[PDB]
């Protein structure tokens, strides 16, 4: 705690709470228009992103579409 001891740092927001980012959650970058968002505030878990080959924030979702999944064929299909 003291006046001085600043980061000098500026970082414009992505997300659409007006949030640079945030490192206890997980954010993905949206392949339409290279914007960076909470996988809370857009509704996309980190552990599903590893197969979002594109994700579409929901911004543009709405020209675009859904967003893309890659393809990870390892062999063939389980069940
Ligand atoms: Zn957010
Ligand atoms: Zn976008």
Do not use: T
Not at 31 to 53: K, M, P, R, T, Y
Request: include cysteine; proline fraction near 6%; charged fraction near 15%.
């Amino acid at each position: 705690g003291s006046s001085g001891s600043s980061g000098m740092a500026l970082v414009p927001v992505y997300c659409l709470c007006r949030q640079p980012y945030n490192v206890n959650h997980f954010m993905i970058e949206c392949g339409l228009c290279q914007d960076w968002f909470h996988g809370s505030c857009v509704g996309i878990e980190e552990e599903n992103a590893v197969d979002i080959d594109i994700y579409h924030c929901p911004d543009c979702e709405a020209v675009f579409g859904p967003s893309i999944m890659k393809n990870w064929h390892s062999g063939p299909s389980s069940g």
